[PDB]
Ligand binder design. Structure first.
Ligand SMILES: [Cl-]
Ligand SMILES: [Cl-]
Ligand SMILES: [Cl-]
Ligand SMILES: [K+]
Ligand SMILES: [Mg+2]
Ligand SMILES: [Mg+2]
Ligand SMILES: [Mg+2]
Ligand SMILES: [Mg+2]
Ligand SMILES: [Mg+2]
Ligand SMILES: [Mg+2]
Ligand SMILES: [Mg+2]
Ligand SMILES: [Mg+2]
Ligand SMILES: [Mg+2]
Ligand SMILES: [Mg+2]
Ligand SMILES: [Mg+2]
Ligand SMILES: [Mg+2]
Ligand SMILES: [Mg+2]
Ligand SMILES: [Mg+2]
Ligand SMILES: [Mg+2]
Ligand SMILES: [Mg+2]
Ligand SMILES: [Mg+2]
Ligand SMILES: [Mg+2]
Ligand SMILES: [Mg+2]
Ligand SMILES: [Mg+2]
Ligand SMILES: [Mg+2]
Ligand SMILES: [Mg+2]
Ligand SMILES: [Mg+2]
Ligand SMILES: [Mg+2]
Ligand SMILES: [Mg+2]
Ligand SMILES: [Mg+2]
Ligand SMILES: [Mg+2]
Ligand SMILES: [Mg+2]
Ligand SMILES: [Mg+2]
Ligand SMILES: [Mg+2]
Ligand SMILES: [Mg+2]
Ligand SMILES: [Mg+2]
Ligand SMILES: [Mg+2]
Ligand SMILES: [Mg+2]
Ligand SMILES: [Mg+2]
Ligand SMILES: [Mg+2]
Ligand code: NA
Ligand code: NA
Ligand code: NA
Ligand code: NA
Ligand code: NA
Ligand code: NA
Ligand code: NA
Ligand code: NA
Ligand code: NA
Ligand SMILES: [Sr+2]
Ligand SMILES: [Sr+2]
Ligand SMILES: [Sr+2]
Ligand SMILES: [Sr+2]
Ligand SMILES: [Sr+2]
Ligand SMILES: [Sr+2]
Ligand SMILES: [Sr+2]
Ligand SMILES: [Sr+2]
Ligand SMILES: [Sr+2]
Ligand SMILES: [Sr+2]
Ligand SMILES: [Sr+2]
Ligand SMILES: [Sr+2]
Ligand SMILES: [Sr+2]
Ligand SMILES: [Sr+2]
Ligand SMILES: [Sr+2]
Ligand SMILES: [Sr+2]
Ligand SMILES: [Sr+2]
Ligand SMILES: [Sr+2]
Ligand SMILES: [Sr+2]
Ligand SMILES: [Sr+2]
Ligand SMILES: [Sr+2]
Ligand SMILES: [Sr+2]
Ligand SMILES: [Sr+2]
Ligand SMILES: [Sr+2]
Ligand SMILES: [Sr+2]
Ligand SMILES: [Sr+2]
Ligand SMILES: [Sr+2]
Ligand SMILES: [Sr+2]
Ligand SMILES: [Sr+2]
Ligand SMILES: [Sr+2]
Ligand SMILES: [Sr+2]
Ligand SMILES: [Sr+2]
Ligand SMILES: [Sr+2]
Ligand SMILES: [Sr+2]
Ligand SMILES: [Sr+2]
Ligand SMILES: [Sr+2]
Ligand SMILES: [Sr+2]
Ligand SMILES: [Sr+2]
Ligand SMILES: [Sr+2]
Ligand SMILES: [Sr+2]
Ligand SMILES: [Sr+2]
Ligand SMILES: [Sr+2]
Ligand SMILES: [Sr+2]
Ligand SMILES: [Sr+2]
Ligand SMILES: [Sr+2]
Ligand SMILES: [Sr+2]
Length: 237
RNA sequence: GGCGGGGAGCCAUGUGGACACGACCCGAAUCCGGACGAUCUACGCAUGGACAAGAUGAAGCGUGCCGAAAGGCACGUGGAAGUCUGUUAGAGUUGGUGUCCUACAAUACCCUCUCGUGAUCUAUGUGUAGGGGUGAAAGGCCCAUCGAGUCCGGCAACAGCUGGUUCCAAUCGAAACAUGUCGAAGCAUGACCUCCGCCGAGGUAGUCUGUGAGGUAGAGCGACCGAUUGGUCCUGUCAAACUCCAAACUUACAGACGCCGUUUGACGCGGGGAUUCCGGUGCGCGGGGUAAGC
RNA sequence: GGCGCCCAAAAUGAUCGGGACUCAAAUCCACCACCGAGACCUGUCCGUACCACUCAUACUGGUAAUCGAGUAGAUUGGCGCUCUAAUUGGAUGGAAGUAGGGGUGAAAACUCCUAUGGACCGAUUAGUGACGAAAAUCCUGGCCAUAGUAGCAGCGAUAGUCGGGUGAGAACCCCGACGGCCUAAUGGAUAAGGGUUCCUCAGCACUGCUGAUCAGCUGAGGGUUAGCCGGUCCUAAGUCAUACCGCAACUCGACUAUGACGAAAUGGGAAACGGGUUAAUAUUCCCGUGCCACUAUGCAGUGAAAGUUGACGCCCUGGGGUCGAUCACGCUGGGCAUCGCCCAGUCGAACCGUCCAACUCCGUGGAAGCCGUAAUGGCAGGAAGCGGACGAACGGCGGCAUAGGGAAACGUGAUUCAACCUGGGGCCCAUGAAAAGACGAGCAUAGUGUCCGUACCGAGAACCGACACAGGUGUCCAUGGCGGCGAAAGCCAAGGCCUGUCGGGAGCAACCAACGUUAGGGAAUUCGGCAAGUUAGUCCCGUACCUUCGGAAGAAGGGAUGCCUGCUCCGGAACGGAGCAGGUCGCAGUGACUCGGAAGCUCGGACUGUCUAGUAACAACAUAGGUGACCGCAAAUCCGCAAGGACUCGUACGGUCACUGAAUCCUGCCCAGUGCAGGUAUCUGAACACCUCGUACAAGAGGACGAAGGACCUGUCAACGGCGGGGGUCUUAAGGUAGCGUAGUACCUUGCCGCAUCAGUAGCGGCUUGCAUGAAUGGAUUAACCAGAGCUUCACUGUCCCAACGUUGGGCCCGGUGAACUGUACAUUCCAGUGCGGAGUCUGGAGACACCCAGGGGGAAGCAAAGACCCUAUGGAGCUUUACUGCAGGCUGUCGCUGAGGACUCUCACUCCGGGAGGAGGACACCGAUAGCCGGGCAGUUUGACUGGGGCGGUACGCGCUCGAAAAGAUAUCGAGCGCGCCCUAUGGCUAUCUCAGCCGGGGACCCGGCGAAGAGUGCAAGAGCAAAAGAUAGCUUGACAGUGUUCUUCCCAACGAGGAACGCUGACGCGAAAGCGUGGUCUAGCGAACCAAUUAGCCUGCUUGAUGCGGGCAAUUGAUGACAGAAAAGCUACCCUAGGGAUAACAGAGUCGUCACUCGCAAGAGCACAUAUCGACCGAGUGGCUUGCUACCUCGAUGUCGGUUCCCUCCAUCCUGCCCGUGCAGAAGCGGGCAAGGGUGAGGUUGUUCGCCUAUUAAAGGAGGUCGUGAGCUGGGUUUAGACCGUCGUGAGACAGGUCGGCUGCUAUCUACUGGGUGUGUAGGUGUCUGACAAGAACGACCGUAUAGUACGAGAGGAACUACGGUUGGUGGCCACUGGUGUACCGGUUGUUCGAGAGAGCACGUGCCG
């Protein structure tokens, strides 16, 4: 047959790439020599193309102007800080260790210094739970108990733009416009509506997959489609 | 039992034929390699551009009235919308199964028709390349080419299938069948045709007679077998898979006559070359089928 | 008994070949004479064979009654062509070749003569071959018919005409007049692309849809001038180069660095305007004026980099404001002349200076309800007011300008205001570039400002499309006037053009294209209202069901509409808008143009949107919404061989993988199979290492351990899918819940009832047993939407009844230009027949004087394309899968990397995070290697044959018997009957003893006797064999033995293996007295190659040699290929492709005739009695060729399918009409029958239908043939490609003799045929009138009514006829006084616009519209 769409994806052509040349900035945490002593002022609020969420532009003391992964509540004029001695207030960034247990955090690093990896989407947030001299347990937006190095930096608060999902797109056109800002090929043709040559579920006089949809995880790309390594399906039971 | 044994081979030239190779010539759909194509088109991206006029009148705001308030009602304001009308520009194409159909045109003309502020249309630039792209998915599109582009190369691909294969004459003259075969549109081996060499005296297409073989026609069944009538032993019927009988006829061998052979060498043996293995008709006998130019 | 007669019906024109024949030219019985082959006889010759002579196959003689045809094929002699050699010749006193002609040879061929030609050419012998053509849809070249034919018409752009100029020549080259065409283009400027097409002169052989003096053509010259217009500079998506790394390698490859590249209309950007000038350039040259950058010098200045700019989305909108347009008045010029109107102009840049609205801000002030807007809004955090700072135009004003331009005047105000400037508001799950540069940052003067582009076209002739192509092709001129909402129509300017480039004739016929108008009827037409039409702009009134409350809605329905006079209101006003009163014309006032027909029911998809470039726009795809799945990021998913990469400037409110498909109500039961996932005591589970055996080692055999996987268990269906049959459970887990239901799913089926219609296979409602509905394979339902499917109604109409007239362009004639298709030949046919069964060419007749014009297309199974359907090929390709075999990929173990102290700690490799310090991890992971599992993701293939085509079914695919099989042998079919693929240690072998089925008699056990050739038994089919046995019983025994052959069989004849049998020799045995019997069962079925393995007993052998291990071999046994003389092997294709086949199917033809239709014979029976008024069973005999079937003869290098339609001929088995007979005939009317084919046989409702059902009319509303007549005539509804849905089936691709929506119809007529028209010849200078062989007709068919007559007849009821009249209908020929239609002659009314008004006219498509 012919390669399925998920395989055309990998080659990374224009159709499947994200409009990077139109993206603003990775919002990785700023690096601090040490002893904290790093504060800045929120000069403006902007719209992050890549995330459909607002982001804040900060001017730090040493004259460095950078966009920051803004939590909900940051406003122009406000003063943010990044370092160990940072004051425990919304918008501030400090090691999971200096953060009191029970505080909502966002843009959590996976490895100290990586600049944040977890909880950066609209309205989401990780809940810090346990502390220690060896590990800091964080509860990620998926509800997973994550064990992190207490030296991993994070921001206090939840990410801006909460409830973005509450409103429906209503029309294809709206969907269209957002898709046009991500690395995603849209719209989607159901494989079962394709010719047998184009996809595992293609062909047949009437549309219906010609096999069970739950594919093994060791299935080769091109064959791995439908419900991947499903532990179960349906809602019943 | 098998193979071998009483000295003929080697080389050369012409010629018949076999096998591999392009293998008498042309003939088609492939498969593979390396290349050239996104000037068409599909999708994305960058930078630009286009959308008369009109209709409808969302939220929001206002005013008045009513209300304790929540708010309600009226009028106005406002100007939303993958909103409406629209040959504005522009995009498209439902029907005429109109015109054209050696065209104006290898997709055109006319009228009607659909879209026309958006998932819109559009110019240029740019990206994705062949088992790979691109695809709101029609196997659609990737330069009149797509269920795997184009060019050249492999390459003079292979075919048991169609077509064709060029001067005269003389001698003989088929097979359309049997056995085997992934065999039935093909082959091989036989049968049969022809050519060469060997052998050396008989041969046998006709008839008659003698010694044998036979159970078909017919006939018959108180001769088997199995069918098949009636009357109170007689009375009525049959047979591809019945036979107490039984031809014509066909056939083995021999003799006789005939014909034929011993310079035309028969009968027979060895070797070279085939073609051939879709047949048909009449007559006799058929088996199937109502029948048939079955 | 002979001949005949009845029985006896078929489609274009009858037949014995024809004529025709009657004491025959018939039939039969005898006879007589003749005609008639290549046969037979005869003369001569030839070939061949044989004989004699001979060296000879050279002569010569002889023989042939017993020689003389031939496809495929075998054998042999000869002709001709090229060049070589040897020998030997010819030619300028004329070679070869060619043309015409003579001679020879059976012939291939040889040779001569004459002409031409003008230089080479042979013969013999031996060689050499790119050695011979009628054919291949063969190749290349040339040429004819086609043909003076088609085209040079069709497009909303109908374009010309009269004079004249030039010229050898003028419809189309130029001037003028008159007449027209184009208005987002037919005008102006340009991008791409072209490349000199541009200008001039001179030309016309070429190019040009005709001509040409013209030209984008030919010849020769010439033409493009820049500091300030582009390029150049900057960076965009993105590209490349170098480095680095990968790769066997590179011209290859991703990342990361660096550099460079990447924008000519249309991204950013230092600076130029106005005028003049040329044949052709022009912000470039010239004149005037201006500006920018750099540099130099001088003065000033120390500021200089913070910041601003470059620099930005979509929607609404206010303010400033120019051009334009318009209004007012003045000036200059023009036009018109019943008036007094109408037109043009009235100019003047860059630049320099200056003015500033908005936004922002400051001072003052002091609002506690005021300020402000189109709107939002603003304020004690300080409103209005007042003053101030900053601050705009491509704009105003002054200069520029006794610059320029104008014949002249050389205006002033206003309104609406493109450009340009500056604000306010709203929107985003969407956030709307970057960089160079500029400003910030003065003034003088001077110098410098190079390089490249610059013509022209930019399109119905300069680009792409082969063309001077009706196609395609980017930007801007979007503000010219009237009009109107308008960038709409229509008309008209500026400007352009008559080149969407052949013309001339005919009231100009038929026919066609595109139109106009049609009385009455009004969808009757058709599959379907297809096509056309109806409606229409604007204002007022008014508006249903339903509904997601948005909508439905312009629902529907009704009314108004011009002009003129005078006014009112809103507004600052408009040359803006809304109204009032009075007057008044027309058939008609949105008068043209522009400009919806409307309503209801049902199906589908929610909606806008997408799609098959080129037959499908849809119900298909998408969508929001719903749901499930994977993943914590060192992730999931995906690309790469690798180096690396997309997702990702992303992080679960994410994004990957899938299903469903808006909203609303909902979404039942099943985990057995399959799939995925988790678990798992035990079982199973590979390699390395380890152990045992073996080997001086190794191969090898076995063991222990045991990863993932599997067995096992569990979870899961919004996973794949399933929810039946039986009874009051069974399979296979469950057994179909809510809904819905004859469905786009219901075969039966036009289901049954109802609605609607004259009549409804339709549609809708209900019922509903659902052949075979059903819940995210989503169910039900649904407002809105729709070029989606079906139905109904109102309105309207030439769709139709039924056609007519007209308009424009063709057609026809003439000048000029000038193809193609097609062509074996011949060809004036027709009716029959024949023939490979579908003939212009054969046979028999008939007809036929030749040639030409026009026509519509009957035939040439017309032309076009080596049929695409179907089958066949040990063909191809795409697709599928639990087909065969493999390859990636993932998971998992193990070895290496890899280190220290069955489980653990550590650090030092290695990995990741961090800028770094260091942090996290860690001998794991990554990487390399290997092993097990998963693995249509991918590759290569296979998937047989037979067959009354193929498939399905079956096997007649290997064997045995009877019959078929025709008395030797052999012998076919999907022929008839039926078997074998074993079984048996005895059911084998021998010997002894004995005789069996069955029946009878005496005491179904047993005993005795009798009859008893064989009917018993003998393992199994069938046929055959057997009686002191081949059977039975008893006993004994292992010959069911080893070796090696002969012969036959397999395979008749006649080659072929395995297998089989009969018969020998040798060995060893058993039984018997012995002869002898035993090589399995009485005979014919019970079977299997090579390679490899195992096994049996000897022996041969392994590379210098010896030993050991482990191999190689001679003979044979066993293991299977049943497709059985042996491949390891599944499907789909309608997306298809190729080779071929009429070797084979689908249409039609042909044969047949069971089937079908019709007839006849007999006549049981019934018909109250009565066979025969009428009906008529059984059985029997036929005719037709209309149904169906069979066959496979014709056709696969094509004969288009059903139905309809239109138009022509025919048949009779007659439905009506005419004339008759019978009756269970009073009459009237029936019923049945006979002759008879002249004429007629119609309109409508469902359905594609044929057919049929139904309705009303009717004299009756018959059937059939013509390639199931009729597609080079129509239609395209059905069938039957490519798209899609449903049901059923299938794991899947996909299928269906099911349903459903959509889906293309080529061609210029050569011949023949006929309808009409001509020219010739014959008869044989003329005019006029006739004749009538033949030919055609339906020229006429049918009905109603009145008198007859309320009569005959009849109890009555009812109710005729002859004949004479009147009329209607269908058909036919003709005509135009009458009625009607047309009537782009004509006359009139009137809308818009242009000519100033008036008058009179043009355009609004071939009449603007109307009468
Ligand atoms: Cl999204
Ligand atoms: Cl000869
Ligand atoms: Cl405003
Ligand atoms: K055919
Ligand atoms: Mg969602
Ligand atoms: Mg989808
Ligand atoms: Mg599809
Ligand atoms: Mg398809
Ligand atoms: Mg597939
Ligand atoms: Mg579906
Ligand atoms: Mg489905
Ligand atoms: Mg309003
Ligand atoms: Mg010959
Ligand atoms: Mg001869
Ligand atoms: Mg007999
Ligand atoms: Mg010689
Ligand atoms: Mg030749
Ligand atoms: Mg002609
Ligand atoms: Mg010029
Ligand atoms: Mg032209
Ligand atoms: Mg009809
Ligand atoms: Mg007023
Ligand atoms: Mg229906
Ligand atoms: Mg739709
Ligand atoms: Mg199409
Ligand atoms: Mg969805
Ligand atoms: Mg369910
Ligand atoms: Mg294949
Ligand atoms: Mg495959
Ligand atoms: Mg192959
Ligand atoms: Mg025989
Ligand atoms: Mg064995
Ligand atoms: Mg065989
Ligand atoms: Mg045939
Ligand atoms: Mg053929
Ligand atoms: Mg008759
Ligand atoms: Mg027909
Ligand atoms: Mg025809
Ligand atoms: Mg046709
Ligand atoms: Mg035609
Ligand atoms: Na003899
Ligand atoms: Na012309
Ligand atoms: Na106007
Ligand atoms: Na299950
Ligand atoms: Na294919
Ligand atoms: Na027809
Ligand atoms: Na008649
Ligand atoms: Na009908
Ligand atoms: Na036909
Ligand atoms: Sr990051
Ligand atoms: Sr980083
Ligand atoms: Sr499928
Ligand atoms: Sr459930
Ligand atoms: Sr392009
Ligand atoms: Sr719209
Ligand atoms: Sr159509
Ligand atoms: Sr039309
Ligand atoms: Sr066409
Ligand atoms: Sr519209
Ligand atoms: Sr080739
Ligand atoms: Sr015989
Ligand atoms: Sr002869
Ligand atoms: Sr002969
Ligand atoms: Sr002969
Ligand atoms: Sr040749
Ligand atoms: Sr010619
Ligand atoms: Sr013309
Ligand atoms: Sr035309
Ligand atoms: Sr001339
Ligand atoms: Sr010119
Ligand atoms: Sr550049
Ligand atoms: Sr530019
Ligand atoms: Sr204004
Ligand atoms: Sr120019
Ligand atoms: Sr054009
Ligand atoms: Sr003009
Ligand atoms: Sr011309
Ligand atoms: Sr008229
Ligand atoms: Sr109708
Ligand atoms: Sr009708
Ligand atoms: Sr009205
Ligand atoms: Sr729903
Ligand atoms: Sr299960
Ligand atoms: Sr014609
Ligand atoms: Sr025997
Ligand atoms: Sr199957
Ligand atoms: Sr299909
Ligand atoms: Sr008759
Ligand atoms: Sr009658
Ligand atoms: Sr029917
Ligand atoms: Sr059709
Ligand atoms: Sr004559
Ligand atoms: Sr009467
Ligand atoms: Sr009466
Ligand atoms: Sr006119």
């Amino acid at each position: 047959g012919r390669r399925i769409q998920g395989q055309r994806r990998g080659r990374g052509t224009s159709t499947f790439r994200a409009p990077s040349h139109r993206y603003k900035a990775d919002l990785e945490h700023r690096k601090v020599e040490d002893g904290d002593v790093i504060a800045g002022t929120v000069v403006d609020i902007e719209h992050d193309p890549a995330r459909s969420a607002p982001v804040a532009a900060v001017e730090f003391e040493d004259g460095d102007r950078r966009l920051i992964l803004a939590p909900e509540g940051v406003g122009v004029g406000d003063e943010l800080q990044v370092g160990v001695d940072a004051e425990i207030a919304p918008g501030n960034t400090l090691p999971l260790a200096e953060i009191p247990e029970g505080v909502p955090v966002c843009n959590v690093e996976s490895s100290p210094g990586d600049g944040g990896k977890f909880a950066r989407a609209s309205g989401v947030n990780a809940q810090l739970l346990t502390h220690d001299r060896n590990v800091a347990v964080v509860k990620l937006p998926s509800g997973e108990m994550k064990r992190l190095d207490p030296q991993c930096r994070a921001t206090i608060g939840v990410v801006g733009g909460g409830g973005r999902t509450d409103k429906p797109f209503v029309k294809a056109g709206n969907k269209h416009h957002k898709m046009k800002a991500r690395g995603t090929k849209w719209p989607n043709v159901r494989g079962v509506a394709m010719n047998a040559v184009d996809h595992p579920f293609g062909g047949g006089g009437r549309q219906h997959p010609g096999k069970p949809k739950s594919i093994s995880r060791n299935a080769p790309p091109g064959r791995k489609v439908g419900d991947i390594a499903s532990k179960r399906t349906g809602r019943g039971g």
